[PDB]
Amino acid sequence: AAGVEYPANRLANISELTLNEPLDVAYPDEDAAGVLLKLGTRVEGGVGPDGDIVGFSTICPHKGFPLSYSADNKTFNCPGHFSVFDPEKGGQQVWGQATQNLPQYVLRVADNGDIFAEGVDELIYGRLSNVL
Amino acid sequence: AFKRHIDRLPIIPADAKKHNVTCHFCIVGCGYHAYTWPINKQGGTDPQNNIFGVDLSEQQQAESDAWYSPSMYNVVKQDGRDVHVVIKPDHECVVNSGLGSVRGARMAETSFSEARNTQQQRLTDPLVWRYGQMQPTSWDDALDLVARVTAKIVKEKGEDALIVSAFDHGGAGGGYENTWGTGKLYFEAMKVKNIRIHNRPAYNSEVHGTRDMGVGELNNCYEDAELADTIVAVGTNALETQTNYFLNHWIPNLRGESLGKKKELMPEEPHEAGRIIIVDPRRTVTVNACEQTAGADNVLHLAINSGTDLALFNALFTYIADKGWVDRDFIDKSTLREGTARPPLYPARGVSEANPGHLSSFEDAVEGCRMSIEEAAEITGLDAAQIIKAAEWIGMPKEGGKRRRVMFGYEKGLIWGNDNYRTNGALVNLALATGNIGRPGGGVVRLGGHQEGYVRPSDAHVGRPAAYVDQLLIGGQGGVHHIWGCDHYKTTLNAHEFKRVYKKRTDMVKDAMSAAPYGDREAMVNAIVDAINQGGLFAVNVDIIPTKIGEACHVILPAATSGEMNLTSMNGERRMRLTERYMDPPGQSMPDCLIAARLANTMERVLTEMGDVGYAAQFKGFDWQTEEDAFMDGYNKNAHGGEFVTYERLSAMGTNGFQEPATGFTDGKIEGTQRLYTDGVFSTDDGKARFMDAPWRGLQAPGKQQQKDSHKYLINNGRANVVWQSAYLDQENDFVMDRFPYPFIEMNPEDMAEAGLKEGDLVEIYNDAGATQAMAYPTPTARRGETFMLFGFPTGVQGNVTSAGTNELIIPNYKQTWGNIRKISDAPRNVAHLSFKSKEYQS
Amino acid sequence: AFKRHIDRLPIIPADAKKHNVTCHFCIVGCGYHAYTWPINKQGGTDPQNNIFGVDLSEQQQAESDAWYSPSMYNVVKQDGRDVHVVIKPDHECVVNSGLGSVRGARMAETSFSEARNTQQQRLTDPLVWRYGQMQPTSWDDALDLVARVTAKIVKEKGEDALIVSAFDHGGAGGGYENTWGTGKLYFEAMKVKNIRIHNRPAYNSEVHGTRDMGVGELNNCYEDAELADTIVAVGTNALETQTNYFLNHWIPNLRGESLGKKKELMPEEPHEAGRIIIVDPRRTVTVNACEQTAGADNVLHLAINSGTDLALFNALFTYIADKGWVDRDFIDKSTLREGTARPPLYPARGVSEANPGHLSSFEDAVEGCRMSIEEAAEITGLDAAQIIKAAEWIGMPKEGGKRRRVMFGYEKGLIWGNDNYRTNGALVNLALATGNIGRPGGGVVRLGGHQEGYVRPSDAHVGRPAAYVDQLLIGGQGGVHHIWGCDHYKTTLNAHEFKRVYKKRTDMVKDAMSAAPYGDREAMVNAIVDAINQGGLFAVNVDIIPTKIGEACHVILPAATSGEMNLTSMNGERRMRLTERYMDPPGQSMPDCLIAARLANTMERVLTEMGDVGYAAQFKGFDWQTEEDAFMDGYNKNAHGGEFVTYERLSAMGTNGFQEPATGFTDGKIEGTQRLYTDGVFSTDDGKARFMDAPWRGLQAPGKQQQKDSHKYLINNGRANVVWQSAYLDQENDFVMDRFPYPFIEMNPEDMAEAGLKEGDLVEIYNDAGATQAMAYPTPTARRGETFMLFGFPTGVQGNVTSAGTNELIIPNYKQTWGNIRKISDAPRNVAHLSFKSKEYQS
Ligand SMILES: Nc1nc2c(c(=O)[nH]1)N[C@H]1C(S)=C(S)[C@@H](COP(=O)(O)OP(=O)(O)OC[C@H]3O[C@@H](n4cnc5c(=O)[nH]c(N)nc54)[C@H](O)[C@@H]3O)O[C@H]1N2
Ligand SMILES: Nc1nc2c(c(=O)[nH]1)N[C@H]1C(S)=C(S)[C@@H](COP(=O)(O)OP(=O)(O)OC[C@H]3O[C@@H](n4cnc5c(=O)[nH]c(N)nc54)[C@H](O)[C@@H]3O)O[C@H]1N2
Ligand SMILES: Nc1nc2c(c(=O)[nH]1)N[C@H]1C(S)=C(S)[C@@H](COP(=O)(O)OP(=O)(O)OC[C@H]3O[C@@H](n4cnc5c(=O)[nH]c(N)nc54)[C@H](O)[C@@H]3O)O[C@H]1N2
Ligand SMILES: Nc1nc2c(c(=O)[nH]1)N[C@H]1C(S)=C(S)[C@@H](COP(=O)(O)OP(=O)(O)OC[C@H]3O[C@@H](n4cnc5c(=O)[nH]c(N)nc54)[C@H](O)[C@@H]3O)O[C@H]1N2
Ligand code: F3S
Ligand code: F3S
Ligand code: FES
Ligand SMILES: [Mo+4]
Ligand SMILES: [Mo+4]
Ligand SMILES: [O]
Ligand SMILES: [O]
């Protein structure tokens, strides 16, 4: 009751992830669009054997515009007001109108390689509680 | 990457108290509301229980009014109790339409909170240098010391011995109440000559040029950016620096969203989607955003050489004139037709330092300004076909022989740029020639910095040109310095030398005060004056935080900023709003206007005791008990149309307020002015605009050509979208300092590789003026030999390498700076976490 | 009153990680645990869901282990991640039994948190004075500069040109790792003589007296305070200054709770509730608490004249010896019998400055110290009856003529009191003569300040007396100053003159650095050395916050403190514990032992480059990569019983640890020493204790009698309960600063009436040494003419009015200070919310 109680939700398997191709996901419910993504390098918040699998809300924390991935620069890009987020560095706003770095998922890889989300490190766009 | 780990915010209840709030920060003046409610109450997820009448148990979609980010939430004191506060963009404000920038959206978390531990740097008490360090004291004690040293020094050496640095701007750290209070103390009660402004080292206008021509620099509305055929943006990075004016008004034009409104408001002519010329030596995120919303076809980025805008504009003026792409009726009806003789020293120098440009008719100006496409190409390093196309995009008529509508926008690339007076003039020539002033879709305007909130008694005594205050201080002149709401240590020109000497002179007074008895005040005062007489300086700082120049000051007085007080200001549209107090001043801090009144009251008492009742009587008229008293004595009595404006009337009109000047009051509505110069009568004795005979004469500020010639790199300088000004609040905001713990210097990747530099490295920029430090940020879009350093930044001050060079009117030529770059150290470990990717959005 | 409005805390979940934490702060070393768990997780009300195994949906009753305050909760970085943390007093620790002081209980709230915005003042980055202000830089760059300057100066002028100020204490800002690191650097690699300690301006001991007599000052156990017939408490305010020793051990003795234990551990002698003698000129909350728990009749408050302890002790020793109220057997078997000749200049002066007192037999010391009740009552201001009763409570055999058990505890009222050496000896005299060393219910002990964590090489080169470092600096000597974890601007003696000169000398070097190019590091170093050669000082600060003395320093190195590092230290009964690292250092901050190591690495590199390979080799043996390497190179190899102690074994023992020295390791337990000297073999060559022939000679430090006679009030000084030390953490803690924004000066209300003062008034304290400020606090229990000012406080430094005066061994006599008091200002507005009521508990 003091903190938000986060579901431990199954998102995908490590086998479902192609290098540099976002897998569309929802966490912590259906209406909280995000992605899983393998980056082929060890980075902040990264899980799996290479420590390169990250999970992010993919709804701009500025005004709720769906973000889009650039494979060449490995950045989320907002076509709303031109915000750029770096999922190699914990989803830092590289430039943008958000007062938040990109809300990022707490991932756990079980033995079978099934990937789980246990929480989010920032307030998701369009909900005043990450769990609704 | 910095994460708040705030999973959940309190819901604003249905019965929350609503306050109209204008953004504290930039010119755009985005509308917000502050909702406050008791700390032990909250809102419900059901419609009847929150402020939005919406079910918040359900995800909200893009552009929702029924959401706020963590930075929009805090807990603050109100009437001496903790309340929840949310500071949210107003969806119904015509300026922003519920947009908030990275800056305005953190008003709440950059507020002072004991409960949530935000901005504990905020000053709570008067501080005095005694017993060998800064010590908190009472207002009565601090004011008595300030007045006794001030009164003695001006009595003994004249008012010329009192030096003043002060804000002249609107919004937080400015505004009509605070400009009036400081203005009345130094210009009514006294005749202070040796006063400078927050951003320039003399008491001058940024834009004497446009003003001498009879064109006030804020002459249009924000709608005109939606209605223009072409936008000409000169030395503006509007997406970073005028963010929601660009996003809410320029973008719709460039994207065609505007076409429907154009056709409704101007049938009887053709309308395509807006195009844009961007005059800026550097490719910005503004150039990128424009390309990406209107396509490269509709965007002409003129990457001029540094400080050659005047050459470009004279060539556009020449070409447009020679084609007759001009509003003949406008020129004949509304501009000066009488020929007038060039000054003797023309074209090298004006008739005087006071008047560096020659005002004249259309025809005299064209022949004066006359420059070939070939020559501008040589100077600007543009291609002929770029300049000719720029001419066509401004001048060439639309299908039915109809006038092309052009909004001309400029800011500090021009104003802090080469030959301020002439460049400003050359740009006004283009808007005048094409009848793009006082018409829909037109204007030749500053895009602005702070909001505006200026009302002061006459400054006639100050002179033109006015005193170069920094040179007086560096040269060992003046006895007492009052500093209000500026920090020269981070933001003045020639800042390295300024600091060298400012420290020595304040150190002399510090040593004297450490060695003298404080509890016997008269002996303390005499030790101060004796130290001043050896070449010392007594410094008083009025601020909201411990400043960098404040580390040299002997007295600090704590100010209350916008939101802790009622504050009135207007935006780059002249849109006047009341920011309604929603919270308490921290500790004993008090509004600047009431500090001025209190210092005035103390000056009166001290001067009476010294036995000069006549001088003491000049310090009457300062019985204000609240900021509203300052509004009524100042704006209400002295502003054009002031008699129509009160707090109550301004409150009723909300975040849309009204455009100045006010013309009347009719059933709960102040009537305003959408556009200036609609009747073609300009701000001159006879009502005619003057053109400017403004010939190119190279880099006009002393030593600039030498500095270009004798150093390897251009140190271009200015704003980051994340950083507000000198990071006075940002330096205690983990979100901003997580992004840039060091000021970035944008460098070409090939330039970095040739200099043995990698991303994050700490580098010394050095030249004739001084030295400073920054973190190398690899920028593919940067031209080779051309760097950009974030200005005014506490962890590396760009001002240290800017020279003392000004134009004849003492305008600081910050942007034309060259220096060398060497390595200090490898990337510090605290930059390892930084993103070094392009700021440019990719489709 | 400051309220956090935190009406709900995250519950520790049942799988939270447990760390053993000794309190950061005072000597008592109360046991705590740090519970951390992942952000995004929490425990529940149900027993299986929380660490307590208890239904938290029920109200907990008094003294529950299943609660914590807001001050005990925070969010910190652990291994690069944000975790919840509760730092909670350990119920199973025998030191405190789940008690936390107002200081230990705010360990969490005074930890660095980006997420909760606590202690943002914490240093994250090296800083260097360049380009007109302090600038952040890399470890490589900052260490290089410190190394190059330190190396050049030492090589041209010798090691005597290096001045060091460093902690020698335990806990946060010391401990075995940190003292060893610093010690090895300046005593092994170098032979620095011009070194002082955090609390005294020479490299001396607080208590050469007790040590020269062969009695180590920490010779008992805390249980002794439970088992004693009489506690003798000299110059200690233990409720405020040794809170949980007082509360968890003295109190049980005074209200008879320990009687059961006394009868069991010591059968065949009588036992009643403990009585207490408090020797303190000031009536403290401790005196009040004692009266309240034991009854007025079991408390003898000897409110002596300031600085007259020695007279009282000599008189008690005389009375006790004449009555034969001594342990003949203890004296004959364990103390020196062979008489010895008084030195030439006795009684006024010892044989030398090195040896102020005469070490001798029992009988010789009785005759040398000989003083009558009549004389001591005249000197001390006590009734003859109070001194007789005190001799009876100390020496008179119990029913059946069983020896009375007496614990003699002293702290800074004696140590910073008049004639340190002889007063210390006179007290030890009383304990030796009564056989109250090495036995249950006995001891003659320092009650202590910080925890203890001293291990360093030989200091023999320092000499005795050692150099008065402050007088060196004030008199223009030394070239480089390394300052570790102390702030003389707030805490040294003669602090006004110290700051005046320290500012001047550091300014000379600041001015040079500002005019020199930094990018040419060789030019910079030259400018610095040239300024040093003109009488300037280059000053390097190793700390965790921006210090007051830091405002004068050229380089600042950020340190990590207890909890962000593993740390070992022992308490007032030698109970060694490991504080297990539970969080990360803020920013690039690093443990002091590792900064010492890194600086030694940099000295070696730099001395190689300079040629001198011989001098460079001396800085080898610093390859440490974690604090445990310092522990193993220092304590493990060099401490008495070190061989038996490792982190792993200390960890196993938890917050009860073991009492040093370690005698063995067996069955997973370090075997300790409950008491020293139980075999009556003392720390001299021949194993006998010496008595001290220690006659009263009035106020012994220079100028002290002159200062008393020429000033109106005693300015007594020392600690507040709420405040930890120089308020270095407390200054960014709203709970503390809300209580005392100014240091209090306790003043008799009649004294206030006479001087025209009201509660809260800002007063100046002034005398021959300097001047300072405090807030007047009406204190009915204050004797007329006697005031008490909070020491070390940032918003009014009491040190400013202490003289340079020391005893022959350079012991600062802070407690004997006299001054005048005059109003600066009526009670400031920021003090209106304060309670001015009595600090004394009422039934
Ligand atoms: N090289 C270079 N230098 C530049 C520029 C550049 O482009 N290049 N730009 C120039 C320009 S355009 C500007 S605006 C200047 C800015 O120069 P400054 O005015 O020195 O910079 P700010 O950070 O706006 O300073 C505002 C100060 O006012 C204080 N303050 C805020 N609110 C209040 C309030 O309510 N009351 C009081 N009393 N104080 C308050 C803040 O704490 C801070 O110290 O810099 C100029 N300097
Ligand atoms: N995010 C943010 N927004 C702000 C501020 C802030 O601190 N942060 N401050 C506000 C204030 S006080 C001000 S004054 C404005 C400043 O607003 P702008 O003037 O728009 O901003 P700057 O970054 O100072 O400079 C604008 C552009 O001038 C270009 N420039 C440099 N030299 C030349 C030259 O010779 N010719 C031309 N044509 N361009 C040149 C630079 O490359 C830069 O892109 O921003 C305001 N808004
Ligand atoms: N709350 C709190 N506790 C602390 C500290 C802290 O800052 N705050 N700091 C710790 C440290 S480092 C230390 S050294 C200890 C100090 O602990 P203490 O030594 O107990 O404390 P002080 O307040 O320095 O002085 C104790 C008493 O000495 C008395 N005194 C003054 N002059 C004389 C004199 O001539 N003779 C005698 N007999 N008494 C005299 C004063 O009236 C005062 O009550 O406390 C430790 N504990
Ligand atoms: N008039 C008068 N003066 C006195 C006394 C008195 O009774 N009367 N008492 C004396 C006594 S007993 C003492 S103990 C002294 C105290 O004198 P100081 O030692 O000057 O006082 P503290 O506040 O303990 O200073 C500790 C410093 O170390 C820093 N610090 C904390 N943790 C760490 C760490 O892990 N590493 C590093 N590098 N720094 C750290 C703190 O921020 C602070 O600046 O004052 C003395 N002064
Ligand atoms: S939110 Fe504030 S900073 Fe400028 S763009 Fe809008 S006014
Ligand atoms: S809690 Fe800490 S401050 Fe002393 S009394 Fe116990 S050790
Ligand atoms: S919604 Fe993404 S930048 Fe505005
Ligand atoms: Mo500006
Ligand atoms: Mo101490
Ligand atoms: O500005
Ligand atoms: O101490």
Numbering used by the authors:
A (entry chain D): 44 to 175
B (entry chain C), C (entry chain A): 2 to 844
What does the paper say about this structure?
The arsenite oxidase (AioAB) from Pseudorhizobium banfieldiae sp. strain NT-26 catalyzes the oxidation of arsenite to arsenate and transfers electrons to its cognate electron acceptor cytochrome c 552 (cytc 552). The AioAB complex consists of two subunits: a large subunit, AioA (93 kDa), which contains a molybdenum cofactor (Moco) at the active site and a [3Fe–4S] cluster, and a small subunit, AioB (14 kDa), which contains a Rieske [2Fe–2S] cluster. The proposed reaction mechanism of AioAB comprises oxidation of arsenite at the molybdenum site [reducing molybdenum(VI) to molybdenum(IV)], which releases two electrons that transfer one at a time to the [3Fe–4S] cluster of the AioA subunit and then to the [2Fe–2S] Rieske cluster of the AioB subunit. The electrons are then received by the electron acceptor cytc 552 (Bernhardt & Santini, 2006; Santini & Ward, 2018).
The structure includes four copies of the AioAB assembly per asymmetric unit, arranged as two A2B2 heterotetramers. In addition to the two AioA2B2 complexes, there are four molecules of cytc 552 per asymmetric unit. The three cytc 552 molecules that lie at the AioA/AioB interface (chains I, J and K) are located such that the edge-to-edge distance between the [2Fe–2S] Rieske cluster in AioB and the heme in cytc 552 is 7.5 Å, which is consistent with fast electron transfer. Surface areas of 680 and 660 Å2 are buried on complex formation for the AioAB (350 Å2 for AioA and 330 Å2 for AioB) and cytc 552 proteins, respectively. The closest edge-to-edge distance between Cys103, which coordinates the Rieske cluster in AioB, and the vinyl group of heme in cytc 552 is 7.5 Å, which is well within the distance for fast electron transfer through the protein medium. HARLEM analysis of the coordinates of the complex predicts that the dominant electron-tunneling pathway from AioB to cytc 552 proceeds from the [2Fe–2S] Rieske cluster in the AioB subunit to Pro122 and across the protein–protein interface to the porphyrin ring and onto the heme iron, with Pro122 at a distance of 4.1 Å from the closest heme vinyl group. The unique cytc 552 (chain L) that associates between heterodimers shows edge-to-edge distances between the cytc 552 heme, the Moco (Mo atom) and the [3Fe–4S] cluster (residue Cys24) of AioA of 25 and 29 Å, respectively. The positioning of the unique cytc 552 in the complex therefore does not represent an electron transfer complex.
